[PDB]
From a paper:
Among immune checkpoint inhibitor targets, the killer immunoglobulin-like receptor (KIR) family is a candidate for the enhancement of NK cell mediated tumor clearance. KIRs recognize the basally expressed MHC class I molecules, conferring NK cells the ability to detect self. Lirilumab (IPH2102, descended from 1-7F9) is a monoclonal antibody therapeutic candidate that was developed to target the two primary inhibitory KIRs (KIR2DL1 and KIR2DL2/3). Here we describe the crystal structure of lirilumab in complex with the inhibitory KIR2DL3, revealing the precise epitope of lirilumab and the molecular mechanisms underlying KIR checkpoint blockade.
X-ray diffraction data were collected and molecular replacement was used to determine the crystal structure of the FabLirilumab—KIR2DL3 complex at 2.75 Å resolution. The final structure is a complex of FabLirilumab with only domain 1 of KIR2DL3, and analysis of the crystallographic packing reveals that the other domain could not fit. Thus, we suspect that proteolysis of the complex occurred during crystallization trials and the extended time required for crystallization. Lirilumab binds to a 954 Å2 conformational epitope on domain 1 of KIR2DL3 that is distal from its single N-linked glycosylation site. No significant structural changes to KIR2DL3 are observed when in complex with lirilumab compared to its structure alone (RMSD of 0.7 Å2 and TM-score of 0.96 for KIR2DL3 domain 1 structural alignments). Five CDR loops of lirilumab interact with KIR2DL3, however the heavy chain CDR loops account for the majority of the epitope footprint, covering 659 Å2 of the binding interface. Many of the key interactions at the lirilumab:KIR2DL3 interface form an extensive hydrogen bond network. First, lirilumab’s heavy chain CDR-H1 and -H2 loops nestle within a KIR groove and form pi-stacking interactions between F31 and KIR H50 as well as between F55 and KIR H40. While the lirilumab epitope is limited to domain 1 of KIR2DL3 (left), the epitope overlaps with approximately 134 Å2 of the binding site for HLA, which spans both domains 1 and 2 of KIR2DL3 (center). Thus, lirilumab directly blocks the binding site for HLA.
Residue numbers in the entry:
A (entry chain L): 1 to 212
B (entry chain H): -1 to 223
C (entry chain A): 5 to 102
The structure:
Amino acid sequence: EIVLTQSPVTLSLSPGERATLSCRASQSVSSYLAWYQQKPGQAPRLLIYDASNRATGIPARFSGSGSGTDFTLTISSLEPEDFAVYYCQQRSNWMYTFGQGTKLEIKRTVAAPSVFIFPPSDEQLKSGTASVVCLLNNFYPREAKVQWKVDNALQSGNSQESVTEQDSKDSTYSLSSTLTLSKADYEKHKVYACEVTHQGLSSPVTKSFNRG
Amino acid sequence: QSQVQLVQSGAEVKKPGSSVKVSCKASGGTFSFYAISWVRQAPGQGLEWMGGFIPIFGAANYAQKFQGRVTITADESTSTAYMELSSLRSDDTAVYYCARIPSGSYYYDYDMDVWGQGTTVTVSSASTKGPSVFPLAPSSKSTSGGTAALGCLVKDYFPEPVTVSWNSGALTSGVHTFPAVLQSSGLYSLSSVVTVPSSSLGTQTYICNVNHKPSNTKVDKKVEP
Amino acid sequence: HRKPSLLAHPGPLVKSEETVILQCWSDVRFQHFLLHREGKFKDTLHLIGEHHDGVSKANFSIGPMMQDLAGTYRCYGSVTHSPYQLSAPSDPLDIVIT
Ligand SMILES: *[C@@H]1O[C@H](CO[C@@H]2O[C@@H](C)[C@@H](O)[C@@H](O)[C@@H]2O)[C@@H](O[C@@H]2O[C@H](CO)[C@@H](O[C@@H]3O[C@H](CO[C@H]4O[C@H](CO)[C@@H](O)[C@H](O)[C@@H]4O[C@@H]4O[C@H](CO)[C@@H](O)[C@H](O)[C@H]4NC(C)=O)[C@@H](O)[C@H](O[C@H]4O[C@H](CO)[C@@H](O)[C@H](O)[C@@H]4O)[C@@H]3O)[C@H](O)[C@H]2NC(C)=O)[C@H](O)[C@H]1NC(C)=O
């Protein structure tokens, strides 16, 4: 079956720059290629149909090109509203397979996170568990590494993190990692730390607490 | 740009191994000689085509990953479309979409695509459970740079969605409500933090406003100690 | 549900980068004319039938001839009463590149 592969995965460009996205098909679809845009929180919107024809109401800055296995979506003069996710979808021989997608994010100056750590609540400890939270606020690039260390021991499998979308003002991301431990294993130990590595950081930063 | 509009059925919560049937009712037109395409997007993942139905040719084309558990159909009126998914697995927890697209080319008189609002389907062996709101107390460990961090943990909840607001919506700037995460328990959990001036930590009253499906509203004050 | 008629002008055998007209008509007052191609890339083009003196016709214009627009062309017609229900397929017309 025809598999649509898109490149790049993430495009980090600045407002006003020309953008180029690529959709490659394992077998020819021959202009039966559609381009969609999904802004976060909304449904996908059709941009280009039949590989090159622009949909009704789409600004002329969006352009479609390609036939067979290679396709290109060009967005000249990136307007701030255009930074979103772009999918390509084949429309050949009654098969409408989608591509993996491509994230169009804003390339700003390097911003490093403000690291805050939160000890477990006394109400949650009565409930029987303990959850420690580390927060990385406002950073760019999105690539960051958080490592929990309990008494100098790297914890693996007990940490769940979630990242926020790029903010529409400072173009940064935020991360929140949570380490959940039983009331039995917590208390058995003392030092709880949170190591953070980022591009905007000359040295790794550690936020720690000692229970009591 | 087409006069046609699509409305889908409501959200659903099914158990692993059951079946769900989502409906797509058309307004201002019929599917006619167009094709019914269903797509699914899981939280954080991308768009996944499930299959299509061309009523004029009585043709149903499906994706290999769903071939065998998926059925796409429509009413003789060609006004309501239906997709039924069987052997439901937790991996099928996603939002499903229905689209009126052309069979192939948009040559000559063909209207632009029309999507529906979507349908959230959650497949889990868990039961409806209210969240537990715990404080993330501000401290020197969260107060550096003259800016202090303050937050709540909405832990152990099902099913989504959960709304979090600070001071009844009077605090929106600095507020970062992080996407929920699915734990091994099958229950969800989210965190929502807000950065406020370090001063005013003891003067200002910060309260979390959390609402959920099991008719649960939990307001929690966030004190400094 | 009566089969329409399909013709190609100037003919079914076409040269590369040349446009042809695939006329679809019938004495029945068909409101929608659908042309379906069978081949390397199947497709279904739609055209509103124009009811002139006696017949309702539709001039399907197959653009610059590429190997992808070649195949077996059959024609259908429907009434807006139920655009879902097509008629009987016309006799197949094979378009081949010279
Ligand atoms: C779908 O396509 C139909 C067929 O179009 C033709 O074939 C397609 C494949 C293409 O090649 C087209 O370019 C081609 O036109 C269309 O029907 C035709 O529309 C055209 C354009 O309006 C008509 O051409 C004009 O006809 C005028 C009328 O004269 C004809 O009709 C008289 C009766 O109505 C008849 O008495 C005449 O003898 C004449 O008949 C034509 O004879 C020639 C030669 O034998 C044949 O080749 C035609 O097929 C005959 N047409 C018939 C039988 O209908 C003319 O007056 C007019 O001439 C104009 O231009 C000249 C200069 O070139 C001027 O000098 C003159 O003053 C005038 O301005 C022109 O030829 C054509 O007749 C229509 N019918 C046919 C069968 O071709 C459909 O309209 C189209 N439908 C859609 C929705 O697009």
